[PDB]
Short mmCIF file of C-alpha atoms and ligand atoms in Angstrom, two decimals:
data_model
loop_
_atom_site.label_atom_id
_atom_site.label_comp_id
_atom_site.label_asym_id
_atom_site.label_seq_id
_atom_site.Cartn_x
_atom_site.Cartn_y
_atom_site.Cartn_z
CA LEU A 34 -3.71 22.36 -0.87
CA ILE A 35 -3.68 18.54 -0.88
CA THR A 36 -2.18 16.67 -3.83
CA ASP A 37 -4.18 14.26 -6.06
CA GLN A 38 -1.28 11.86 -6.36
CA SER A 39 -0.79 11.82 -2.59
CA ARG A 40 -4.52 11.15 -1.87
CA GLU A 41 -4.52 8.39 -4.45
CA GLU A 42 -1.37 6.73 -3.07
CA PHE A 43 -2.70 6.84 0.46
CA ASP A 44 -5.77 4.91 -0.80
CA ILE A 45 -4.06 2.29 -3.00
CA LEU A 46 -0.75 1.80 -1.18
CA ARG A 47 -1.28 0.46 2.38
CA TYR A 48 1.28 -1.42 4.55
CA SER A 49 0.59 -5.15 5.19
CA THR A 50 2.44 -5.45 8.42
CA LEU A 51 1.11 -9.05 8.71
CA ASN A 52 3.17 -10.02 5.65
CA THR A 53 6.39 -9.90 7.71
CA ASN A 54 8.06 -10.93 11.01
CA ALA A 55 10.93 -8.51 10.61
CA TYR A 56 10.25 -5.55 12.88
CA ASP A 57 13.66 -3.90 13.19
CA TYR A 58 12.38 -0.75 11.45
CA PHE A 59 9.01 -0.25 13.21
CA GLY A 60 8.55 2.14 16.04
CA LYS A 61 7.60 0.20 19.21
CA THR A 62 5.40 2.89 20.55
CA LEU A 63 1.70 3.35 19.74
CA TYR A 64 0.73 7.07 19.92
CA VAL A 65 -2.98 7.75 20.30
CA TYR A 66 -5.12 10.89 20.57
CA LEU A 67 -8.75 11.50 21.24
CA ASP A 68 -10.99 14.48 21.76
CA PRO A 69 -13.95 13.39 23.81
CA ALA A 70 -17.03 15.26 22.63
CA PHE A 71 -19.71 16.80 24.83
CA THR A 72 -20.63 20.37 23.86
CA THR A 73 -23.97 21.44 25.48
CA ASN A 74 -27.19 19.45 24.96
CA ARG A 75 -27.87 19.26 21.21
CA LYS A 76 -27.31 16.37 18.83
CA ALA A 77 -23.85 17.26 17.40
CA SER A 78 -20.84 15.24 16.05
CA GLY A 79 -18.88 12.39 17.65
CA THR A 80 -15.40 11.73 19.08
CA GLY A 81 -12.24 11.18 16.91
CA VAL A 82 -9.64 8.53 17.97
CA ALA A 83 -6.42 7.74 16.03
CA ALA A 84 -3.59 5.35 16.66
CA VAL A 85 -0.23 5.78 14.85
CA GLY A 86 3.38 4.40 15.02
CA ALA A 87 6.59 4.99 13.14
CA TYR A 88 7.96 3.03 10.23
CA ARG A 89 11.47 4.08 9.17
CA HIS A 90 10.86 7.72 8.28
CA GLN A 91 7.03 7.22 7.80
CA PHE A 92 4.01 7.18 10.08
CA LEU A 93 1.54 4.43 9.92
CA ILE A 94 -2.17 4.71 10.92
CA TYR A 95 -3.09 1.63 12.90
CA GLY A 96 -6.56 2.59 14.12
CA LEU A 97 -9.40 5.07 13.62
CA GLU A 98 -12.63 5.56 15.48
CA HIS A 99 -15.34 8.12 15.14
CA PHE A 100 -17.71 7.38 17.95
CA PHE A 101 -21.35 8.52 18.43
CA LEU A 102 -23.25 7.62 21.59
CA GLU A 107 -25.31 5.48 29.27
CA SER A 108 -22.13 7.00 30.75
CA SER A 109 -20.80 8.95 27.89
CA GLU A 110 -17.41 8.73 29.53
CA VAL A 111 -17.45 4.96 29.77
CA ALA A 112 -18.72 4.49 26.20
CA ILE A 113 -15.98 6.83 25.00
CA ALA A 114 -13.15 5.23 26.95
CA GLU A 115 -14.25 1.65 26.04
CA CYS A 116 -14.39 2.45 22.34
CA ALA A 117 -10.83 3.90 22.56
CA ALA A 118 -9.63 0.97 24.58
CA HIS A 119 -11.20 -1.70 22.38
CA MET A 120 -9.42 -0.22 19.35
CA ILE A 121 -6.04 -0.11 21.23
CA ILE A 122 -6.30 -3.75 22.42
CA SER A 123 -7.01 -4.98 18.87
CA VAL A 124 -4.10 -2.96 17.54
CA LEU A 125 -1.70 -4.31 20.18
CA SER A 126 -2.94 -7.80 19.34
CA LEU A 127 -2.22 -7.33 15.62
CA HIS A 128 1.29 -5.82 16.11
CA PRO A 129 3.15 -7.61 18.85
CA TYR A 130 6.28 -5.57 18.34
CA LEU A 131 4.42 -2.66 19.95
CA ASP A 132 5.68 -2.53 23.58
CA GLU A 133 4.48 0.91 24.87
CA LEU A 134 1.39 3.20 24.66
CA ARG A 135 1.37 6.96 24.72
CA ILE A 136 -1.99 8.58 24.93
CA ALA A 137 -3.18 12.17 24.78
CA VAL A 138 -6.74 13.03 25.76
CA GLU A 139 -7.89 16.52 24.87
CA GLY A 140 -9.61 18.31 27.66
CA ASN A 141 -9.91 21.77 26.28
CA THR A 142 -13.24 22.87 27.78
CA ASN A 143 -14.05 19.94 30.08
CA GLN A 144 -10.83 18.77 31.71
CA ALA A 145 -12.39 16.95 34.63
CA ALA A 146 -14.14 14.57 32.19
CA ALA A 147 -10.86 14.06 30.28
CA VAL A 148 -9.19 13.12 33.56
CA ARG A 149 -11.79 10.46 34.20
CA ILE A 150 -11.71 9.21 30.65
CA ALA A 151 -7.91 8.84 30.73
CA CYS A 152 -8.29 6.83 33.88
CA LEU A 153 -10.99 4.65 32.28
CA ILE A 154 -8.84 3.93 29.26
CA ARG A 155 -5.81 2.94 31.31
CA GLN A 156 -8.22 0.64 33.17
CA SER A 157 -9.60 -1.33 30.13
CA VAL A 158 -6.19 -1.55 28.53
CA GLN A 159 -4.47 -2.95 31.64
CA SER A 160 -7.36 -5.32 32.38
CA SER A 161 -6.82 -6.85 28.96
CA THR A 162 -3.05 -6.83 28.36
CA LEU A 163 0.35 -6.11 30.03
CA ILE A 164 1.99 -3.02 28.55
CA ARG A 165 3.33 0.33 29.85
CA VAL A 166 0.83 3.11 29.49
CA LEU A 167 1.84 6.82 29.60
CA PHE A 168 -0.48 9.78 29.29
CA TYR A 169 0.31 13.29 28.10
CA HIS A 170 0.44 15.34 31.35
CA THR A 171 0.02 19.06 31.72
CA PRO A 172 0.28 21.30 34.81
CA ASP A 173 -3.00 22.67 36.18
CA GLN A 174 -3.92 24.91 39.16
CA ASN A 175 -1.85 24.20 42.24
CA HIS A 176 0.79 23.19 39.68
CA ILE A 177 -0.23 19.48 39.79
CA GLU A 178 0.07 17.35 36.61
CA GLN A 179 -3.20 16.00 35.25
CA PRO A 180 -3.61 13.37 32.45
CA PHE A 181 -4.87 15.79 29.81
CA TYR A 182 -3.64 17.66 26.73
CA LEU A 183 -4.64 21.16 25.77
CA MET A 184 -4.94 22.36 22.20
CA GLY A 185 -3.56 25.82 21.79
CA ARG A 186 -0.85 27.27 19.59
CA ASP A 187 0.00 23.69 18.70
CA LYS A 188 -2.85 23.17 16.20
CA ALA A 189 -1.40 25.42 13.49
CA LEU A 190 2.07 23.74 13.59
CA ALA A 191 0.41 20.30 13.58
CA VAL A 192 -1.93 21.09 10.66
CA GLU A 193 0.83 22.66 8.62
CA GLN A 194 3.24 19.79 9.42
CA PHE A 195 0.59 17.16 8.40
CA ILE A 196 -0.21 18.78 5.09
CA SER A 197 3.48 18.82 4.24
CA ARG A 198 4.11 15.20 5.35
CA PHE A 199 1.03 13.87 3.56
CA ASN A 200 1.99 15.63 0.30
CA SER A 201 5.38 14.11 0.43
CA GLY A 202 4.28 10.52 1.06
CA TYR A 203 5.03 10.39 4.80
CA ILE A 204 1.57 9.45 6.10
CA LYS A 205 0.39 5.91 5.39
CA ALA A 206 -2.41 3.58 6.39
CA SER A 207 -1.83 -0.03 7.22
CA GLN A 208 -3.92 -2.76 5.49
CA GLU A 209 -5.11 -4.31 8.86
CA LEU A 210 -6.24 -0.84 10.17
CA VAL A 211 -8.68 -1.39 13.16
CA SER A 212 -11.95 0.47 13.25
CA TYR A 213 -15.01 -0.87 15.03
CA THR A 214 -17.16 2.26 14.58
CA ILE A 215 -16.35 2.91 10.90
CA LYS A 216 -15.57 -0.38 9.04
CA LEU A 217 -19.10 -1.63 8.87
CA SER A 218 -20.31 1.49 6.98
CA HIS A 219 -17.26 2.66 4.98
CA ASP A 220 -13.69 1.82 4.12
CA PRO A 221 -12.11 3.92 6.99
CA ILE A 222 -9.44 5.32 4.74
CA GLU A 223 -12.08 6.48 2.15
CA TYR A 224 -13.98 8.10 5.02
CA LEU A 225 -10.77 9.73 6.31
CA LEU A 226 -9.98 10.95 2.74
CA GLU A 227 -13.36 12.75 2.60
CA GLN A 228 -12.18 14.73 5.63
CA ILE A 229 -8.66 15.32 4.25
CA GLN A 230 -10.32 17.13 1.34
CA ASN A 231 -12.06 19.45 3.81
CA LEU A 232 -8.81 20.60 5.39
CA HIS A 233 -7.86 24.34 5.53
CA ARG A 234 -5.03 26.21 7.32
CA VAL A 235 -6.50 28.34 10.22
CA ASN A 251 -19.26 25.44 8.74
CA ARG A 252 -20.68 21.90 8.83
CA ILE A 253 -18.17 19.57 7.29
CA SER A 254 -17.04 17.38 10.18
CA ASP A 255 -13.31 17.42 10.84
CA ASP A 256 -13.03 15.34 13.98
CA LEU A 257 -11.26 12.19 12.77
CA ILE A 258 -8.71 14.08 10.66
CA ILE A 259 -7.58 16.37 13.54
CA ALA A 260 -7.13 13.26 15.64
CA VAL A 261 -4.75 11.84 13.06
CA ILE A 262 -3.00 15.21 12.67
CA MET A 263 -2.39 15.32 16.46
CA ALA A 264 -1.36 11.73 17.05
CA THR A 265 1.21 12.18 14.26
CA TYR A 266 2.37 15.50 15.72
CA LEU A 267 2.90 14.23 19.27
CA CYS A 268 5.13 11.49 17.78
CA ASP A 269 8.25 13.79 17.92
CA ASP A 270 10.72 13.88 20.89
CA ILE A 271 9.85 17.52 21.51
CA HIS A 272 6.85 16.11 23.44
CA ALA A 273 8.46 12.98 24.88
CA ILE A 274 8.93 14.17 28.50
CA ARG A 275 5.20 15.15 28.73
CA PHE A 276 4.18 11.51 28.73
CA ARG A 277 4.13 10.06 32.18
CA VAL A 278 2.72 7.13 34.11
CA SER A 279 -1.00 7.78 34.90
CA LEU B 34 22.57 -6.50 -6.05
CA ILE B 35 19.26 -5.87 -4.49
CA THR B 36 18.96 -3.93 -1.25
CA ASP B 37 17.57 -5.39 1.94
CA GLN B 38 15.05 -2.60 2.41
CA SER B 39 13.73 -2.94 -1.15
CA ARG B 40 12.95 -6.57 -0.71
CA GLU B 41 11.08 -5.74 2.59
CA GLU B 42 8.97 -3.01 0.95
CA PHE B 43 8.17 -5.33 -1.92
CA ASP B 44 6.86 -7.80 0.59
CA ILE B 45 4.80 -5.42 2.78
CA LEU B 46 3.67 -2.71 0.35
CA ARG B 47 1.34 -3.90 -2.44
CA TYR B 48 -1.06 -1.99 -4.67
CA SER B 49 -4.69 -2.38 -4.03
CA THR B 50 -6.34 -0.92 -7.05
CA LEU B 51 -9.94 -1.74 -6.13
CA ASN B 52 -9.90 0.96 -3.52
CA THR B 53 -9.80 3.51 -6.39
CA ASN B 54 -12.44 4.07 -9.01
CA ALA B 55 -10.92 7.09 -10.85
CA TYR B 56 -8.09 5.58 -12.96
CA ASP B 57 -6.57 8.57 -14.92
CA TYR B 58 -2.85 7.77 -14.04
CA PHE B 59 -2.89 3.95 -14.68
CA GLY B 60 -1.73 2.58 -17.82
CA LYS B 61 -4.52 0.76 -19.50
CA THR B 62 -2.02 -1.53 -21.20
CA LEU B 63 -1.11 -4.97 -19.84
CA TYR B 64 2.51 -5.93 -20.97
CA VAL B 65 3.14 -9.68 -20.94
CA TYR B 66 6.42 -11.43 -21.58
CA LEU B 67 6.82 -15.23 -21.74
CA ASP B 68 9.73 -17.33 -22.69
CA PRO B 69 8.62 -20.85 -23.75
CA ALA B 70 10.74 -24.02 -22.92
CA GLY B 79 10.32 -23.93 -16.83
CA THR B 80 8.44 -21.31 -18.87
CA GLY B 81 8.05 -18.05 -17.01
CA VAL B 82 5.23 -15.62 -17.68
CA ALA B 83 4.68 -12.24 -16.20
CA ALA B 84 2.06 -9.48 -16.65
CA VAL B 85 2.74 -5.83 -15.64
CA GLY B 86 1.39 -2.31 -16.22
CA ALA B 87 2.14 1.21 -15.21
CA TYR B 88 0.95 3.42 -12.38
CA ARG B 89 2.31 6.92 -13.09
CA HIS B 90 6.06 6.40 -13.52
CA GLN B 91 6.18 3.18 -11.57
CA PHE B 92 5.22 -0.44 -12.30
CA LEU B 93 3.09 -3.17 -10.86
CA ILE B 94 2.94 -6.82 -11.38
CA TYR B 95 -0.56 -8.23 -12.01
CA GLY B 96 0.21 -11.84 -12.79
CA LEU B 97 2.91 -14.48 -12.73
CA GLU B 98 3.12 -18.05 -13.94
CA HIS B 99 5.90 -20.60 -13.90
CA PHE B 100 4.68 -23.56 -15.92
CA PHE B 101 6.12 -27.01 -16.15
CA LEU B 102 6.79 -29.09 -19.22
CA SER B 106 0.86 -36.48 -22.53
CA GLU B 107 1.88 -33.84 -25.13
CA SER B 108 1.04 -30.69 -27.16
CA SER B 109 3.25 -28.41 -25.15
CA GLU B 110 2.51 -25.37 -27.34
CA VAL B 111 -1.24 -25.54 -26.74
CA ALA B 112 -0.61 -26.15 -23.04
CA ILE B 113 1.75 -23.21 -22.64
CA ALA B 114 -0.54 -20.84 -24.62
CA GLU B 115 -3.49 -21.80 -22.49
CA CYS B 116 -1.57 -21.15 -19.26
CA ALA B 117 -0.44 -17.64 -20.38
CA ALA B 118 -3.95 -16.93 -21.75
CA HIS B 119 -5.82 -18.04 -18.54
CA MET B 120 -3.82 -15.65 -16.38
CA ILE B 121 -4.36 -12.79 -18.89
CA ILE B 122 -8.13 -13.41 -18.90
CA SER B 123 -8.31 -13.40 -15.08
CA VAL B 124 -6.15 -10.31 -14.75
CA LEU B 125 -8.28 -8.46 -17.41
CA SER B 126 -11.44 -9.75 -15.80
CA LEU B 127 -10.41 -8.19 -12.41
CA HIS B 128 -9.17 -4.88 -13.87
CA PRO B 129 -11.77 -3.72 -16.46
CA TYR B 130 -9.84 -0.37 -16.98
CA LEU B 131 -7.19 -2.44 -18.83
CA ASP B 132 -7.95 -2.11 -22.54
CA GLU B 133 -4.97 -3.13 -24.60
CA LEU B 134 -2.56 -6.14 -24.42
CA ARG B 135 1.00 -5.98 -25.52
CA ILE B 136 2.62 -9.37 -25.59
CA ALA B 137 6.17 -10.49 -26.27
CA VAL B 138 6.91 -14.13 -26.89
CA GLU B 139 10.61 -14.93 -26.75
CA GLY B 140 11.94 -16.97 -29.66
CA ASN B 141 15.59 -17.95 -29.00
CA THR B 142 16.23 -20.97 -31.24
CA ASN B 143 12.65 -21.76 -32.18
CA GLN B 144 11.14 -18.87 -34.05
CA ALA B 145 8.45 -21.17 -35.54
CA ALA B 146 7.08 -22.38 -32.19
CA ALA B 147 7.05 -18.86 -30.65
CA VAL B 148 5.01 -17.81 -33.65
CA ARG B 149 2.44 -20.63 -33.24
CA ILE B 150 2.09 -19.87 -29.48
CA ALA B 151 1.52 -16.15 -30.21
CA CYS B 152 -1.36 -17.21 -32.50
CA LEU B 153 -2.84 -19.65 -29.98
CA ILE B 154 -2.61 -17.07 -27.16
CA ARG B 155 -4.36 -14.53 -29.36
CA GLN B 156 -7.06 -16.98 -30.21
CA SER B 157 -7.85 -17.96 -26.56
CA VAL B 158 -7.86 -14.35 -25.40
CA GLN B 159 -10.17 -13.22 -28.26
CA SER B 160 -12.63 -16.14 -27.76
CA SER B 161 -13.09 -14.97 -24.12
CA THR B 162 -13.16 -11.19 -24.33
CA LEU B 163 -13.23 -8.15 -26.60
CA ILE B 164 -9.81 -6.48 -26.43
CA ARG B 165 -7.17 -4.94 -28.60
CA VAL B 166 -4.17 -7.40 -28.75
CA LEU B 167 -0.67 -6.52 -30.12
CA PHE B 168 2.50 -8.68 -30.25
CA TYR B 169 6.16 -7.65 -30.32
CA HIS B 170 7.37 -8.18 -33.90
CA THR B 171 10.86 -8.98 -35.32
CA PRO B 172 11.81 -9.22 -39.04
CA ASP B 173 13.35 -12.57 -39.84
CA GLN B 174 15.35 -13.89 -42.86
CA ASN B 175 13.16 -12.48 -45.64
CA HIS B 176 12.60 -9.29 -43.55
CA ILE B 177 9.02 -10.49 -42.87
CA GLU B 178 7.83 -9.04 -39.54
CA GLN B 179 7.03 -12.02 -37.24
CA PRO B 180 5.46 -12.01 -33.75
CA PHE B 181 8.46 -13.03 -31.69
CA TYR B 182 11.08 -11.28 -29.57
CA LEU B 183 14.77 -12.15 -29.70
CA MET B 184 16.83 -11.57 -26.65
CA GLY B 185 20.31 -10.61 -27.49
CA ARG B 186 22.56 -8.21 -25.78
CA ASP B 187 19.58 -6.19 -24.51
CA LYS B 188 19.25 -8.59 -21.59
CA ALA B 189 22.13 -7.01 -19.63
CA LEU B 190 20.51 -3.64 -20.24
CA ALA B 191 17.09 -4.87 -18.97
CA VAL B 192 18.70 -6.41 -15.88
CA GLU B 193 20.52 -3.11 -15.00
CA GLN B 194 17.35 -0.97 -15.30
CA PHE B 195 15.42 -3.48 -13.25
CA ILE B 196 17.98 -3.37 -10.39
CA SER B 197 17.94 0.42 -10.32
CA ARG B 198 14.03 0.55 -10.40
CA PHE B 199 13.61 -2.25 -7.91
CA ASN B 200 16.06 -0.62 -5.43
CA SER B 201 14.26 2.68 -5.77
CA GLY B 202 10.88 1.10 -4.93
CA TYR B 203 9.44 1.63 -8.48
CA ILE B 204 8.43 -1.98 -8.96
CA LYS B 205 5.67 -3.40 -6.79
CA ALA B 206 3.16 -6.28 -6.71
CA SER B 207 -0.57 -5.90 -6.78
CA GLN B 208 -2.48 -7.33 -3.79
CA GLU B 209 -4.72 -9.17 -6.20
CA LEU B 210 -1.83 -10.70 -8.24
CA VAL B 211 -3.03 -13.74 -10.33
CA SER B 212 -1.08 -16.99 -10.46
CA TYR B 213 -2.65 -20.41 -11.17
CA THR B 214 0.60 -22.20 -11.36
CA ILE B 215 2.31 -20.93 -8.15
CA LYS B 216 -0.49 -19.67 -5.84
CA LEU B 217 -1.63 -21.70 -2.83
CA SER B 218 1.13 -23.95 -1.46
CA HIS B 219 3.39 -21.02 -2.29
CA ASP B 220 2.93 -17.23 -2.14
CA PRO B 221 3.98 -15.91 -5.59
CA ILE B 222 5.69 -12.88 -4.03
CA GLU B 223 7.76 -15.10 -1.76
CA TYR B 224 8.81 -17.33 -4.67
CA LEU B 225 9.74 -14.34 -6.82
CA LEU B 226 11.59 -12.80 -3.90
CA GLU B 227 13.75 -15.93 -3.72
CA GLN B 228 14.70 -15.57 -7.41
CA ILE B 229 15.39 -11.80 -6.86
CA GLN B 230 17.75 -12.58 -4.01
CA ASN B 231 19.53 -15.06 -6.28
CA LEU B 232 21.11 -13.44 -9.32
CA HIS B 233 24.09 -11.55 -10.66
CA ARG B 234 25.47 -10.53 -14.04
CA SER B 254 16.22 -21.18 -11.69
CA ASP B 255 15.38 -17.65 -12.81
CA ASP B 256 12.80 -17.99 -15.54
CA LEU B 257 10.24 -16.08 -13.56
CA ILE B 258 12.33 -13.09 -12.58
CA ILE B 259 13.57 -12.79 -16.16
CA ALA B 260 9.97 -12.55 -17.35
CA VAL B 261 9.29 -9.75 -14.83
CA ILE B 262 12.49 -7.95 -15.88
CA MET B 263 11.68 -8.18 -19.58
CA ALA B 264 8.05 -7.31 -19.14
CA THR B 265 8.90 -4.08 -17.23
CA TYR B 266 11.72 -3.32 -19.63
CA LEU B 267 9.31 -3.52 -22.64
CA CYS B 268 6.96 -0.99 -21.11
CA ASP B 269 9.16 1.96 -22.28
CA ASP B 270 7.99 4.17 -25.08
CA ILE B 271 11.16 3.32 -27.09
CA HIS B 272 9.68 -0.15 -27.78
CA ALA B 273 6.07 0.86 -28.46
CA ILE B 274 6.50 0.82 -32.25
CA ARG B 275 7.59 -2.93 -32.31
CA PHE B 276 4.17 -4.03 -31.02
CA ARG B 277 1.60 -4.61 -33.85
CA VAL B 278 -1.73 -6.30 -34.44
CA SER B 279 -0.84 -9.78 -35.64
MG1 MG C 1 6.30 -12.23 3.81
MG1 MG C 2 -12.77 19.75 22.11
MG1 MG C 3 -11.40 4.89 -2.36
#
């Protein structure tokens, strides 16, 4: 499934973006994805956030969060926003944000969360923010993304990119909810090992990386619109 | 000539070995080349089919130059070995163009300082001279052009990288060793004492040379 050489190179070969001021080859757009977590009542998992950008033909992971909880929606949005602001701060060449917020069962909450994220970001820094928009009932666009047939293409595309060296972490990777307990990349590797094609091995951060990387292509570029 | 993109990668993509604890596809051999007089020193080893640089010195010549030089090469080797305990053999080549005798005394001093500090297997490149007695020096001749060509081809392909935790006591801290090496890389065609040491050190990692290295 996943190569040993590719897992090992992802760990020991990370990009030190801070070592250079020559940005010609970096993508200027930060893609992020999150899947805010509610389920019912019980103590379950958390919420995966990932932030990625292009470098030549590669994709670079700038940020990871795996967040566990008063307003769940504010805590969630704030932890996404805080990661994004640090990332923008570390990589000034980044001049646009494109954000997808999964709303699969609870789309009202994903609406509000999108709106809260755009709020913290814009309070802190001047940048254009775009959200993945999808049609709803009376055919009106709403700032959410829906997982569906996509997930298989995305998973299968990740596995193939990772195996061939296309997925890389940066050295200055931001993670306020992981870094104090683990190297975030070692944590993310534990999940990459748990990957199958398509019952209690968490997979939330890895899917978030799979999806941020996936919505990178131009096939999705019109879906992103001012929220 | 070296490609623009290869130089950029070399700058922004460095090995961090301390993130791993497995080790099965490292070489456990540190290859060191120095050419005494500046005197350039480099230390490299393998990761799979590629190469990384663990240490670099460029060392400037009261007296006892030989002792001084040996102690400089030896200090970097100690530090590099001390930071990478999976490394368990040293293969050293001391270049001897014109002064075979001094290269031989420096080999012996380097061996002594390394073995007073740490338990490790230590081999030197050997060359037969006059009486066909195998001696611990290396003679550059016409192989130099060949080492420069392979290095250009490997560097352009991305096969040669620095380690994050690169040791240099002679260059490091008013200069970044990578920067200073990059300036030499940018500069040659067919002072450069440092990039020559890196070229020859990665050239001597091939299996074809393994049999010239012996316990001295
Ligand atoms: Mg630099
Ligand atoms: Mg969900
Ligand atoms: Mg690790």
